[PDB]
């Protein structure tokens, strides 16, 4: 029922982990491979290995989560070596996704070239929106810098590429970004990364709950579904059909997944909910979505994909 | 216990309605006056009377609300005539707040001049962030246009003035805006207006819940407290002490109020929660806040105002 075609590849279902969650080590990745997830993506990596920000840096919240991980990762070469060797065993339906989040344009270009030169036949995701690195704003909020980077990227990168975008809240920003993105042979757009620099407070102790950046961190979960759905839908009605979409944000139940698909998303990523529940979430949500489809008499995602009705 | 000094005026408590909620007519305003609210503000007005967007345009949600009112209001002259006549009876402790949201820079300048020329001795709030007007982006997201407007405003407006800002999600944006605002003799900054262009979906009917803008509307309530608290706090540590702050967003309990004050807010505005509960909310939340203060042994807001601790 959930069979999906994305980036010219076949997946058993649209579900994936969101980058940053349950994908730090080879062990995490193999666990995602063994789960019911239709596909998975690696932790955004940087050229060098990173310890990340001081703890506590992640906190579960009643309505979601707040975090300022600081991009902890085992380094580009670690992830590249992994996907390459994995690619050779052909032990899974659908390619693996490789996320990169360079500390600079030079680092991103350098990593993209290594991927281009390697035999990697999977999908690449360029993270233009990490909101938890001190003294480093979000690239995707600088429309000019974003376009400049993408133009250079496409003078050499020919492999499948998607971009992880932060949320937008003004319709003109969607128009500007869509116009920028439509000029490239992009494979997809992933909306959205966590809502940037939010704040949670323990009223009793009268203090923040995470140590870095004075408690400011990216917000995920139920808090952001309205924003995530809007971004997926807004880009769905503005991006040329060649550029598909991955919906990310506030997905916890089959109903949340249904809403994202209804907006126009093809693949779906789970962050906060996966972090709290573990890989078993995929089996649960898959069944929840199929039950919704069965009640409505739908046998394939194409029966409602992108069909959100206006009043 | 909640006595507050703001814009050189005395208020019995920091609570107010948020512009747009329970302040459309003279009758709504008198009801706010009769309530326990420490102060109140009028519905953002335009030079001409406006019917607003087609219904349904506002919907209560489990975690908040979504709306695209379209600035319905009875016109500038209506509100001005009201505050002027009320001013003469001196029937309340603390001045009234007058919100304006011109459809253009010219309309805003025109309204500010009328206020400047009139005998209005109250406080004025310039709304630079209405996210529900079709074909009209948010001014406060255009740093250049915002500064240009404010420079012209201050060549003639000498009365108390505050600005209603949309939420920011990047630390550099806070730096840019603070630098812009600090150059003016601004009375205050009100963070934040609703989270712009979010989307809510009825999964059963497979459609949006509000008619205008294909269902996209401003998000309010619990959904946005993390963002609202961050904006209040971020500006609190960047604005010169002459510019005070009004905290708005996700305030429903005395605890939410406590958090905003802890971040640096002096006055507090309630939107969504007031819309659902009615003016009686003020009596409730006031008692909830005093109970929190009593448990902690605080006798005045100054005992914890702005004292949010970092880890
Ligand atoms: C602990 C944690 C780490 C994350 N790290 C990354 C990351 O490395 N790269 C990335 O693109 N997004 C990262 N994100 C954001 C997610 O990919 C996702 O966009 C966000 O959490 C919104 O989805 P959710 O509502 O399901 O949590 C991270 C989120 C969390 C909670
Ligand atoms: C029905 C409705 C109408 C609103 N109209 C205005 C308005 O005219 N001017 C303004 O500055 N904000 C307006 N807002 C936004 C609020 O003032 C407030 O910033 C927002 O709702 C965030 O607060 P909350 O979480 O308490 O709802 C409106 C909000 C709602 C729900
Ligand atoms: O690793 C992180 O801190 C991080 C990166 C990113 O892109 N998003 C997020 O929420 N956290
Ligand atoms: O009247 C409206 O539509 C409106 C204005 C504004 O500034 N904010 C909001 O949420 N609605
Ligand atoms: Mg598997
Ligand atoms: Mg009263």
Swiss-Prot record, chains A, B:
Required co-factors: FMN
Alphabetical keyword list: Cytoplasm, Flavoprotein, FMN, Oxidoreductase, Pyrimidine biosynthesis
GO biological process: 'de novo' pyrimidine nucleobase biosynthetic process; 'de novo' UMP biosynthetic process
Annotated binding of substrate, by residue: 43, 67-71, 127, 193-194
Binding residue positions for FMN: 19, 43-44, 127, 164, 192, 221, 249-250, 271-272
Top-level enzyme category: oxidoreductase
This enzyme's EC code(s): 1.3.98.1
Catalytic residues identified in the record: 130 (nucleophile)
A GO molecular function held by the record: dihydroorotate dehydrogenase (fumarate) activity
HAMAP family tied to this protein: DHO_dh_type1 (MF_00224)
Family: Belongs to the dihydroorotate dehydrogenase family. Type 1 subfamily.
Function recorded in the entry: Catalyzes the conversion of dihydroorotate to orotate with fumarate as the electron acceptor.
Subunit structure and binding partners: Homodimer.
Name used for this protein in its record: Dihydroorotate dehydrogenase A (fumarate)
Species of provenance: Lactococcus lactis subsp. cremoris (Streptococcus cremoris)
């Amino acid at each position: 029922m959930l069979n999906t075609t994305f980036a010219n590849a076949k997946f058993a279902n649209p579900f994936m982990n969101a980058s940053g969650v349950h994908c730090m080590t080879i062990e995490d990745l193999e666990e995602l491979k063994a789960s019911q997830a239709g596909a998975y993506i690696t932790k955004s990596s940087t050229l060098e290995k990173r310890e990340g920000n001081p703890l506590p840096r992640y906190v579960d919240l009643e309505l979601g989560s707040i975090n300022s991980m600081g991009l902890p990762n085992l380094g580009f070469d670690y992830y590249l070596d992994y996907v390459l060797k994995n690619q050779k065993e052909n032990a899974q339906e659908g390619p693996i996704f490789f996320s990169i989040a360079g500390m600079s344009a030079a680092e991103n270009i350098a990593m993209l070239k290594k991927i281009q030169e390697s035999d990697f036949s999977g999908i690449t995701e360029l993270n233009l929106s990490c909101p938890n690195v001190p003294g480093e704003p979000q690239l995707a909020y600088d429309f000019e810098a974003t376009e400049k980077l993408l133009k250079e990227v496409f003078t050499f990168f020919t492999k499948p590429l998607g971009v992880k975008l932060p949320p937008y809240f003004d319709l003109v920003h969607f128009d500007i970004m869509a116009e920028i993105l439509n000029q490239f042979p992009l494979t997809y757009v992933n909306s959205v990364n966590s809502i940037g620099n939010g704040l949670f407070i323990d009223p009793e102790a009268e203090s923040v709950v995470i140590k870095p950046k004075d408690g400011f961190g990216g917000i995920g979960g139920a808090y952001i579904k309205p924003t995530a759905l809007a971004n997926v839908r807004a880009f769905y009605t503005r991006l040329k059909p060649e550029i598909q979409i991955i919906g990310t944000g506030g997905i916890e139940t089959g109903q949340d997944a249904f809403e994202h698909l209804l907006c126009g998303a093809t693949m779906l990523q789970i962050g906060t909910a996966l972090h709290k529940e573990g890989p078993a979430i995929f089996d649960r949500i898959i069944k929840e979505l199929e039950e919704i489809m069965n009640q409505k008499g739908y046998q394939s995602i194409a029966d409602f994909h992108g069909k959100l009705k206006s009043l």
